[PDB]
Design a protein around this ligand. Structure first.
Ligand code: 5DP
Ligand code: HEM
Ligand code: HEM
Ligand code: HEM
Ligand code: HEM
Ligand code: O
Ligand code: O
Ligand code: O
Ligand code: O
Lengths: 141, 145, 140, 145
């Protein structure tokens, strides 16, 4: 559960990400597949060769989903109900992968925003993603 | 652990790393992002806010001591278990640190390294380091498993 | 937490009833015996076999849990004062919470075997996890 | 690992355990309580409701096998690393089962023991089995350690 301070930090951080959401979304997965090879097994149908057009088209989806979550921080379950339908009941994704993606995402945001990625924000986004992760792993319908 | 090609770029990059600046930041964030870690450093002083944790002098001085032993493990890459047998025993038999927390510090290190180097720290170069930290963490959790 | 989860947890804790006090005392003894590193959070306590302290303390936990079961929709609000302690003051490692979660689920299994169905097992685990997350969060 | 007194009583209690009945319940409850584990058993048929899971013939037939590997490892408590060496290599290269999931099953098995034995599964008798299921847990993750 987030503080008002946690929610301010998150909202500000994504206000600095801006249009580069798709760029970091795509970079996050690129990093995930390379850093942790096991996460490729959920994507046997994907093109995973360095600089894939599919990964870049898909990375934009993830970042478009996280940007909705920011708009509705007081209702993460209601906003992300359809994504729990997929990641939890359908794909049945192991929650440990969610830690790996969030880590790969947090690294991405750190490299591009070293001026805005302060320890105070670091904690807040870590909590934020672990709350999105909890929603997508839980069967609540 | 790493192959011969994966040893070269991991060491060449490591030489560019400032062991004081990064050390005091990685441990700093460990106590901010993961607040329950503050319990191990009660003697260390004021760790109330994100400002205090980052500017605590004992924090920063102890931060380098970690990265120096990390820098020590960069040489003895094949015998990490042997190099960390002293520090693996100390952290559980005396300090009762949970082996899961080790994984977090190797994680925080990468994030700080990416923050300090930006594009110089690439997806491929990160992948080699993710194994390094996952080897050092496992070497420090050796007394358990 | 689903609608069946909320119902299961209520029904389970209802079957617990007035026994909760003893179960809170067992859930403790079972933790301090199985995971001896947790005994470091209670240095001032007398952790002997069948303690007056431990038994009296287990009563506080179960009572506060009962409050959590009655406040399933707003756990952050109801457990706001417990978070102040466990998160801000005590600075407890989250793995200990999972260890109490597992210890308590053992106590409920042995004592209530007819009621501890796989459906209810999954619900209580999902409830304790969500309670643990509240108590290890600094939302002030 | 266990001592002499711890070992002798852990063996005594296990004799009263019905291999067939406990195995199906444990694997079932693993799939019910932790439902992300169901992806690994897609071939097993129907997994829609908890009742379909707890009555699935393939699930129950396989739970018997895992308990037989557990009974075997109970006879070789002096060396679990070598006994679970084979299955360890299976869960990594062929299955990619995360080492964290072994902790959950070890814990499920314990809960399953406690339900079927009530008070007879004493708090001390539980703690001794917590060393076993954790001792096994490390042996199946020795490729990741
Ligand atoms: C686990 C961790 C560890 O350190 N070890 C020791 C051995 C090191 C592991 C290793 O050598 N890794 C390199 C990458 O893996 C290649 C493995 O060797 C190739 C043979 O095994 C592969 O064959 C099968 C069958 O052809 C492949 O499976 C296919 O189908 C499944 C269907 O679910 C998968 O989705 C796909 O990966 C694949 O299309 C699979 O690639 C096997 O690895 C450890 O053992
Ligand atoms: C931060 C948490 C996550 C978010 C916000 C997220 C978001 C999304 C989105 C928006 C889609 C597109 C669905 C569609 O329209 O097809 C998707 C698909 C998918 N995701 Fe995730 N995801 C997350 C975590 C994960 C993780 C960790 C994995 C495992 C590596 C995963 C596995 C998949 C798979 C297998 C698909 C289906 C691919 C397809 O479209 O064919 N997700 N996710
Ligand atoms: C990447 C993994 C880790 C490494 C490489 C590491 C390394 C070190 C080093 C080099 C020391 C100094 C010991 C000496 O001077 O002899 C130390 C001390 C200590 N560590 Fe760790 N550590 C790690 C993880 C952790 C974590 C996550 C914690 C929990 C917060 C922890 C708890 C402690 C404590 C309480 C001390 C003693 C502090 C003092 O009195 O100086 N360790 N560690
Ligand atoms: C979700 C599960 C938990 C609940 C419901 C809970 C609730 C409580 C309650 C009601 C008290 C008594 C407060 C008072 O003094 O009036 C307490 C105290 C305390 N708890 Fe917890 N707690 C939980 C988890 C944990 C865990 C896992 C630990 C670690 C073993 C822990 C450590 C402590 C400590 C050290 C105290 C202070 C004891 C004293 O000074 O009297 N808590 N908790
Ligand atoms: C306590 C730790 C565990 C032990 C001792 C164990 C043991 C076994 C055994 C004896 C087999 C049968 C070997 C064979 O004949 O191929 C097996 C297969 C298998 N296990 Fe595990 N297991 C454990 C945990 C897990 C976990 C946590 C998962 C993931 C949810 C898992 C997934 C599988 C799968 C998918 C198979 C092959 C299924 C099939 O082909 O029928 N196991 N394991
Ligand atoms: O994803
Ligand atoms: O440390
Ligand atoms: O407690
Ligand atoms: O299994």
């Amino acid at each position: 559960v987030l503080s008002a301070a946690d929610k301010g930090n998150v909202k500000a951080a994504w206000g600095k990400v801006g249009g580069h959401a798709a760029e970091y979304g795509a970079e996050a997965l690129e990093r995930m597949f390379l850093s942790f090879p096991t996460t490729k097994t959920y994507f046997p149908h994907f093109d995973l060769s360095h600089g894939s057009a599919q990964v870049k088209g898909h990375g934009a989806k993830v970042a478009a989903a996280l940007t909705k979550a920011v708009e509705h921080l007081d209702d993460l379950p209601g906003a992300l109900s359809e994504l729990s339908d997929l990641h939890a009941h359908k794909l049945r994704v192991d929650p440990v992968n969610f830690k790996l993606l969030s880590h790969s995402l947090l690294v991405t945001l750190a490299s591009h925003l070293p001026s805005d990625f302060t320890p105070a924000v670091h904690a807040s986004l870590d909590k934020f993603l672990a709350n999105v992760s909890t929603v997508l792993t839980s069967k609540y319908r | 652990m790493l192959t011969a090609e994966e040893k070269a770029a991991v060491t060449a990059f490591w030489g560019k790393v400032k062991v004081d600046e990064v050390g005091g930041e990685a441990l700093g964030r460990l106590l901010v992002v993961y607040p329950w870690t503050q319990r191990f450093f009660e003697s260390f002083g004021d760790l109330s806010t994100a400002d205090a944790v980052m500017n605590n002098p004992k924090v920063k001085a102890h931060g380098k001591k970690v990265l120096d032993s990390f820098s020590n493990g960069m040489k003895h890459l094949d015998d990490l278990k042997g190099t960390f047998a002293a520090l693996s025993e100390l952290h559980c038999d005396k300090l009762h640190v949970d082996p899961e927390n080790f994984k977090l510090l190797g994680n925080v290190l990468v994030v700080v390294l990416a923050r300090n180097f930006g594009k110089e720290f690439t997806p491929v170069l990160q992948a080699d380091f993710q194994k390094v930290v996952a080897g050092v963490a496992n070497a420090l959790a050796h007394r358990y498993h």
